[PDB]
Structures are given as C-alpha cells and as structure tokens.
Symmetry: C2
Subunit: 476 residues, 2 copies
C-alpha cells in the first residue's frame, strides 16, 4: 500500500505488457522482479587501476573487506558485491558469474546499503561497458575515481562513461589522493579532469567532483585539509541520504525505462508495418536496416521524443540483424496509450504521495561506519589610532620616501627590535597590506602594534582580521 | 642582419608575392608593414563586463590609467591602447577608430610592452569577433578574464573564443577575484569554467587558468593566498618573459599565415581553373560556391593540409559571392614552391640562429611595475618514546575500549589539564591521526606530549610534521 508498491503495480499493469509484446527483453532489458523494488540500495565504485576503489570502500566501512585486498600494481580482477551478512567471509556466486564474488560482514553500513566493487578499467574478457550499463540501470549511486597522482582517461573509460549515458544524475566523480600532490598541481589536474569529462559526457550540465583522499592515512601535503574534510562530508551526506529516498530514484528510473520502451515499441511497430506479407521479406529487411537512422529520425519527426530516448542505431542494427521481422507485432495504440497515461497522470499523483513519504523516517539513514559523527572530534573602530602619533613620530624619523618606508629600512628597524626572524617575517607579511613591499604610515603603525603585541607575549594571528586592517580596508 | 630581419625578407620575397597574386588582402589579411616586425609586443586583455580587465592592467602597472576608470555596472565602451609615452594623458586615434583611444604614461612596463584594453563582452556596433581575430593575429598574449564571483559564459564570448581559433597558444585564461568566494565554491566555479571551455574551444590540449585576484585590495576569504600569489607569479613570469622572445612568436605566426595563404591560393586557383572561358560564367560560379565544402574537402584529399588550415566555408562564401571569378589567377606552381621551400628549409635554418639569439639579453625583460622583486618582501627517531611508558600508565588507567580511548573521556581528561578549549581542540585535531574520533596509546602519548609542550610555553604547530607522527606514520 506504499509508493514503491504503487510503482510496482504501475509497472506490472502498464509497462510489462508493452515490453512483453514488443519483446523488449531480447533487445535492452529483461522484465523486472520484485527484487528490484524491495531490495537494499546499491552503490557502485568504478575507476581505473590503482585509483583506490577498494581503499575507498574500506574507508567507508572503516573495516577491511573479507575477500578484497589492496596493492600497488593491479591486484583484484572481478566484481565484489560487498554486502551485509552475519558471518565474515566469502562466496563466489549462458551468463557468467565466475567473474563475480560476494563478501559479507556484520556492519551497520551494510545494514543500510550494499556496495559493489568493480574491476579496474584498463589504462578482452567480458562486455564491461554493457555490465556497467546494466548496473547503471539498477544502481543508486555510481562513484567514479580519478587519482590526482596519475591523471589518465583511457579509451576504455570513455567507453564506460559512454555507457553510463542517461544516468549521469547517479554519478559522483571523486578525485582521489588529492593530498599527495602540491596544490597548484592539484588545480592543474582538476582542470584537466573537468576539461576531459566536459568533452566526453557531452551534457550541458556539469558533474560534481568530490576532492579528497579517502583513507585513514596521514596527509602528505596538508595545506588543503579543510577542503578535503568538507568534500568528504558532502559526499558522505549524499551516500548516507540514500535509504531515505529510494522510492524517488526508483520512480524516476521507471519513467526513464518507460520512455525507452515506448520508443522501441514504435521502432518494431514501424518495421513490422513496413514488411511485405509473403515475398520480398529478405532485402526489404536488409535494406530496412540500411534505412534505420532515417526511421529513428522520421519517428522523431512525427512522435515527439528526444534524441536522448533512442538506442544506438548500430547495436540495434546488430540485433535487428538477429531477428525475424515477419514475427514482429504491429502498432497497438491501446498499450501505448496505457503507457503515456501511466507516466503522465499516474506518476503525477504518485508525486504528492511521494513527498508525504519523503518526510517520514530518517531512521533508514545509513548508520556509523565512516558516517558516525563522533569521528569529527569532541570539540567543535581601530586599535592603533591611540598610539598612532607616536608610531608616526618614529616612522617619519626613519626618513621614508613620500609616505612609504623602503623594505630594507623597515627590515633593519624591525630586526632592530631584537625579535627572531621568523616572527618578524610573519609580522611583515601581516603588515604589508597592499603588499607592494614598502610600509606607509598606517601599515607601519600596524607593524609596530604587532611588534609590541609579540613583545608582551602574544601569539600572532595567521590572517589579519578586518578590525586590524587600517581603515582604508575593504568595500562591502 | 638579425632574425626578425631574416623573417621580414623571407616574408617579402617568399610570401608577399603569393598573397598579392591570389589577392589574400581582400579575403583575410592585408600585407604586412615593417611595423609588425619592429614594434613593441602587445598584450591583450579581454573578458566580459566587470571581470576586472581595467583593474588587472591598473594592477600590472601599479598605476592608474590616464583615460580608463573603473566601476560597478559597465563603464568604458571602447579599445584603450595603454602604451608608453613621455606625457600623461590621452589622444583618440572606411575603417572606424572613434571606438579607439590611446593612453600614454612614463612607466617601465610600458617601455617593455604595451597593453591594449578592450570593451566588455556583452553577457550591435562593430565586428567584435573580427577585431579580436585581427588582434589575435597580431598580439603576443591574450588574457581572458572570468570572475569567480559571477561565472557566466555568454554566447558573444564563445563567439569570441571561436574567433581566437588557431591562436590558443597565446591565451592565458585568468579566473579573477577568486578571493571573494569560499573555497569549495571556488572549486565549483573553476570546475564549471574548465567544463565549459573544454566544450567550447574543442582542442585536446587544455588551456592554463591562472587563479587569483589581481588588485592591491585586502583578501576577503584569505585561506588560499599562497595559491594566489603563486599563480600570480607564474603569469607574471609569462608576461615578463615576452620581449626576450618575440622573434619566436613572430616566426611562428609567419608560419601560420604561410599555411593559410597556401590553402587559399589553392582555393582561388581551383575555382579559376574550373571557370568556363566566355559563357556560362554566372551559374558555374553560383553553383561553384554551392559546391564549396566539396572543393575544400577534395583539396584536402589531394594536397595534404589540415582541417585546421581552412577558412570558414560560409564567410568565404559571402566574399566569393562578392568577387569576379574570370578575374582570378591560375595555379602557379612556382610561387607555391617558393612558399613550401621557404617554410621548410629556410625556417629550418632560422631555428638554430634563433636559439643562439634566445640566449642573448634578458635586458629586454619587463622592468618593475607589478614585476619588481622587492614586492614580495625583504624577508624570504620519535620524541615521545622516552615518556611513553608513563603516558601509557595514564592512558590505561583511563579505561579505554580495546586500545582506543573514547573522545568524551579524552576530552574530560584534556580539559582536566586546565588548558583553554581552543588550544585543547587544536591539540586534539593534531593528535587524532587516523582521525576516527578516539585516541589509541600512541596518539594519546602524542596528545600528552603536546599538552606538556604547551604547558612549558610553546606555540603549537599548525600541521603535525612527520617526526612527530607515531611511527605507524606513512609509506614513501
Ligand atoms: N587516498 C589515497 N592516497 C594515496 N594513496 C592511496 C589512497 N588510497 C589508496 N592509495 C594507494 O594507492 C593504491 C591503490 O590501491 P587500491 O585501493 O587497491 O586501488 P584500486 O582502485 O582498488 N586498484 P584495482 O582494484 O586493482 O583497480 C594502493 O597502493 C594504495 O595503498
Ligand atoms: N580582484 C578583484 N576582486 C574583487 N573585486 C574586483 C577585483 N578587481 C576589480 N574588482 C571590482 O569589480 C568591478 C570590475 O571593475 P573593472 O576593473 O572596471 O572591470 P572591467 O572588466 O574593466 N569592466 P568593463 O571594462 O566595464 O568590462 C569593479 O567594481 C572593481 O572594483
Ligand atoms: Ca605597503
Ligand atoms: Ca584515533
Ligand atoms: Mg581493487
Ligand atoms: Mg573597463
């Protein structure tokens, strides 16, 4: 009596019949079970060799994976479905599953979701893309890893991303080990990545990248850790927030499928309606698949669907090559109508019910692993105008240019204050506000203030706060 | 007797004749003067409204521009050639120059180079792109500004970048005012920019962006200033290093032009060779321009040039529309040969002479403005193993889980040390190395060490250095 229930009935009564009639199962997807309506949300981790997928998961679980280890040059070569289970251990599952393993372990995260770990994308066994597309159809989130340490986008990869088409909304691109590269360089890599991806996925809507280094190791180059913890938090929120709304992603994928189904129905229908009854069959067919892009196109001319909805002409050509046309069924306006109406109105009403559900129970939310909150720790006019005239007395007794004291002179004086170099350098950096290399009266008074401050026994700030900036400070 | 000299003669004797014969001047570019061989290198600053072009220049010169002011909503509407001169002031210059102004001022930077400032690209007066292309042909560097504060890539802009085609090597993309946006957001914008640009310019080679805020104002959000000063330094080196090698960029642009010339020569030649002597002229022409892409293409079939070398078919169609075919000249293998040979062998020998020149005088280098060096300022096993057993005594007297002390307990103890919260929080952050939220024995000993340290009267580090990381530290 819930919403996924409603989705399921909608499917069974409105979609399934059309799929079965135009034999969707032998072209794109087999019919769905209850298992893909009533099962734990999956996240998929993909990327090329040594990008840290396994590490990433290890890190999400803050626990080691029974079957999967981690190493320098490529180690594991198959799909590991990291999922819940009462015992620690493993179990290895026309179709081929010997390239498929299953790991189980008592762990809350695995209560909330399950994480399927993939083989590394090469920088000739199966139809990797095809499987990525199958998962893409089924899965809740797709994590793509790039490592800022060895930026590479292989052909195979861009084929994979080609295969994730229509599901970009499920993609989280994470740029890993950003902590093992000097920052400028990071900028360089990030830039390259987004350029590349930009050209590759081709959508006008930009993918979010999460910048960090997903492992409990110390940070190599630490001067960016704020950003890393932040990005990590964002992604974690995104993952942790999955169980709360699977209904929505389900609904949505149902819509997408629907659209594809409708398209293909039209395709077969038209082919069948083009076929001659008894003789000529052969070449009317071969030619008919010679004229496929014409078909798709015209069908767009007179039906209103998006280039986004159509399958691949050539693959569809392979398969169409495999089928018998005379056996195809004809256009059936009834079932179609059922469809159009379904999505339109029925999904219309499911929306409101959905919202009402989308404020129900955060209990479903993913519980501690790398998610636990205790992991962040248990903890969390102008002042110199009084001494100005004095400072000025000094400053002007130091013979400045035209209001600006040379850097060298400033230094000799400063070092004259018998303070250690380091402190002084920091003070300089703090005081040279327009940062030209000299010190004018105000900047100088500031410097002096800071020197006195340190003399009293005061840690210096690391960034000059507004209240200390000479009043020629900043518009707002 | 120098290299630009040699270039000039090469041009005059090997290129000019071909241009003049196939009337290059009435299609792409007029013939060159000595003035574009013997003149001060230009840099061009472009971008859309309020991106800070004028500010950028102001900042490069560390001086205000006589004619050009700066404001909130769009202010200046023309081209300002900021160039050297003995007096401060201005002077306003079929062609139209009333959209052109000239400013002069005594200033070293203006001794080394001149900077042409442009109107803001709208987010119907002239052929903006065309002029950007003319400058692109002539100019040494092209600065494109985007502001991290209002990321927008207008149609007009992408038309401009479309117009910079073939000269991307001269492009420095700078993302301005990066200091007025929180860092994550910066990442977001940068990402967007590179995605967009990626899709727009279309080359497999990625453009460098320089991230900063080019003005002497204080920094809004300061926690990225290292990067900003760094990027600034890189760009400055790039600009400052121009006079040192104009010969190279000249040579190179000469090559590029050559290639274009050759192409177009072929085009006209073929058209003329297709034209019928006395009658039929009319439609053989109109049709001949109906079949232009066919021409270009076949000419690639049988001549070996790159899609990179060909003009725009449609524009060439407008102009071809303007010309008389019977007046065109025929293919002249001689002049062409002269060309091919020129670039090939002659440029071959110019290279070595060039290198010898490219180690001659850095004196030409741009002198102080924002370039002066004095602007950066006048300034620039494990230790706890001894007290370990003691610390451990405490740690284990605190009843930890299985080697890990809960965060709350750790806190009560720490706060027990009667240190201020802030310090303690910092210490925590420093000590929780695997950053899970508890403290194991080593991490705890570290914490203790740090606490004692602060008690003695010691500033805390801001980043735990390797020598202090418990020996389970980091692979290398
Ligand atoms: N965040 C990180 N920063 C730096 N190094 C890392 C990080 N994560 C993992 N590594 C190291 O980089 C390598 C990648 O390890 P791994 O986690 O196996 O990647 P992977 O994607 O599982 N490789 P594969 O499964 O063979 O495609 C290992 O040697 C790790 O020790
Ligand atoms: N680095 C910076 N950070 C923040 N704000 C800036 C920066 N540079 C300039 N501004 C402000 O942003 C606006 C842009 O000023 P301006 O230098 O005139 O840009 P512009 O590109 O010359 N505009 P236009 O010539 O009309 O296209 C002005 O109000 C400046 O005060
Ligand atoms: Ca100063
Ligand atoms: Ca810890
Ligand atoms: Mg692995
Ligand atoms: Mg301006």
């Amino acid at each position: 009596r819930t919403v996924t229930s409603s989705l399921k009935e909608l499917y069974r009564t409105k979609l399934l019949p059309l799929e079965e009639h135009y034999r969707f199962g032998s072209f794109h997807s087999p019919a769905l079970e209850d298992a893909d309506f009533d099962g734990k949300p999956m996240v998929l981790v993909a990327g090329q060799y040594s990008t840290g997928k396994t590490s990433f998961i290890q890190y999400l679980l803050e626990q080691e994976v029974p079957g999967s280890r981690v190493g320098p040059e490529p180690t594991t070569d198959c799909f590991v479905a990291v999922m819940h289970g009462e015992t620690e251990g493993t179990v290895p599952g026309n179709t081929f599953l010997n390239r498929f393993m299953c790991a189980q372990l008592p762990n809350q995260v695995l209560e909330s979701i399950s994480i399927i770990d993939t083989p590394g994308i090469l920088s000739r066994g199966y139809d990797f893309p095809a499987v990525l597309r199958w998962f893409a159809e089924r899965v809740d989130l797709i994590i793509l890893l790039f490592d800022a340490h060895k930026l590479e986008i292989s052909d195979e990869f861009s084929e994979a991303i080609g295969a994730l088409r229509g599901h970009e909304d499920k993609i989280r691109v994470v740029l890993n080990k950003a902590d093992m590269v000097e920052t400028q360089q990071l900028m360089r890599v990030y830039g390259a990545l987004m350029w590349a991806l930009g050209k590759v996925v081709g959508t006008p809507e930009v993918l979010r990248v999460y910048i960090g280094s997903f492992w409990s190791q110390p940070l190599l180059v630490p001067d960016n850790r704020r950003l890393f913890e932040l990005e990590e938090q964002d992604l974690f929120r995104d993952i942790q927030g999955l169980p709360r709304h699977a209904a929505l992603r389900k609904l949505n994928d149902l819509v997408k499928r629907a659209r594809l189904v409708r398209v293909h129905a039209y395709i077969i229908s038209y082919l069948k309606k083009e076929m001659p009854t008894v003789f000529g069959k052969e070449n009317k067919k071969k030619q008919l698949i010679l004229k496929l892009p014409v078909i798709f196109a015209k069908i767009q001319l007179e039906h209103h669907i998006s280039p986004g909805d159509f399958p691949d002409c050539q693959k569809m050509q392979e398969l169409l090559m495999a089928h018998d046309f005379t056996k195809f069924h004809s256009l059936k306006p009834k079932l179609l109508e059922a469809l159009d109406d379904m999505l339109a109105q029925d999904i219309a009403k499911l929306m409101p019910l959905l919202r009402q559900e989308e404020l129900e129970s955060v209990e479903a939310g993913v519980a501690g692993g790398a998610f636990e909150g205790t992991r962040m720790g248990p903890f969390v006019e102008w002042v110199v105008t009084k001494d100005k005239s004095k400072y000025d007395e000094i400053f002007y007794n130091l013979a400045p240019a035209d209001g600006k004291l040379s850097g060298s002179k400033a230094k000799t004086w400063m070092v004259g204050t018998k303070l250690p170099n380091s402190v002084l350098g920091r003070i300089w950096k703090l005081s040279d506000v327009d940062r030209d290399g000299m010190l004018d009266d105000e900047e100088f008074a500031l410097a002096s203030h800071l020197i006195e401050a340190k003399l009293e026994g005061h840690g210096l700030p690391t960034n000059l706060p507004r209240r200390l900036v000479p009043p020629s400070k900043r518009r707002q």
